[PDB]
Amino acid sequence: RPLWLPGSTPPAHLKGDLPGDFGFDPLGLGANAESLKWFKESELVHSRWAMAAVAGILVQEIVRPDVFWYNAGKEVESPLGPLGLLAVEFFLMHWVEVRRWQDLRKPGSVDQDPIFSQYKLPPHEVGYPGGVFAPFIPGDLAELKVKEIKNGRLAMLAFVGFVMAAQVTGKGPIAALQEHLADPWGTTIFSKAAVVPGQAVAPPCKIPASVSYKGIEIPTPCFLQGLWP
């Protein structure tokens, strides 16, 4: 059985039933049944959101190399006003998240289409809607589920790395990859900073403290810059 540490004893609350179960829980946050049931949905939502975000950032830089992803919310002009876009996004996201949350607390209760009484989602698990949400399923269900959770974990760590690299160097993922491949011995985080008992040096935050978006001065600070190594 695959585990996060070969030859290690997995925790008692992890029996290898859920997809992606590799017996990794040092804090035991998944010991409770209700907490684990809620965290499973949270991890699935996080996985899909991070995968979509990483794909979006990569396509955004490849297609548009002159637009920084961190500045994507700043240098994009659209006829639809920012307040109108926020209202539309808030209403649609609120509706879908309410439906998902109700299915979490009460399974098989919001699977019915309100406008048309003939459409209804087939019985499924929690966090895996299926039906209209899964038109094509090429391969095994359990195998694809494991692939989904693994790709999601990698995408979550990838988005965190994207944010940190954009805050430390100010370059996108492709730009950072090329700069790192050019000088690998001097472009890693170890080369940029080091801490000793007599000195503590950290790389400067390339992101400006304030961003003037229609004269409002939106604060854009580097995530925990004081704790940077």
């Binding site: 010991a31 007599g198 004081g226």
Partner: protein, 213 residues
Amino acid sequence: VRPVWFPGNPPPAHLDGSLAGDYGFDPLFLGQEPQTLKWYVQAELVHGRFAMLGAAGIILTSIGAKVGLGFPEWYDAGKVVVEKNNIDFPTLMVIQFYLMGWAETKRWYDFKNPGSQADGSFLGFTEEFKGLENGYPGGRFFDPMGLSRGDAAKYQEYKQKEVKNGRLAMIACLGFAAQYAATGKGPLDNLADHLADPNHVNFATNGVSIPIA
């Protein structure tokens, strides 16, 4: 059997090792009575939790102060916030006293009558204020991760870690106060001065701690 604060000395009868962080340290017998020990247990837990929050905040602010971030020291943050932001000090004090009064009063009356706050008289919430043990208020609001309702051994280990970290944070806050009153600078400034020269920059050379030096 278990380790004590003074090896070779027998532990007292009122300290049998049932509580977390029990080392049999009570030379003045202040907690010999059961109700008094219960009250002191809750007092020590609250003190340690507040000390932990204070030590974490002071360390983080001093970290931001050492680096070029403009963070004020912990002994001047109140003045900086009250003068920088148009905030009335007595109004903030009254709001803080109102919130703390409501929370601490519910906690006090729960200590007097365990499980009384779970009657549903506060907005209908019942299981969120039922309470687990003395000084350990379990529930979905205080413990949304559910760590107190699963893996008993891990829970006891976390209880020991919490009491030890609380005592360490209390000692840390006392050290912060003494360091500020003796050297005049922040804790990280004192740490940098000590790391720069540990043989000559310490409490034996500050000129305040040891008067005969």
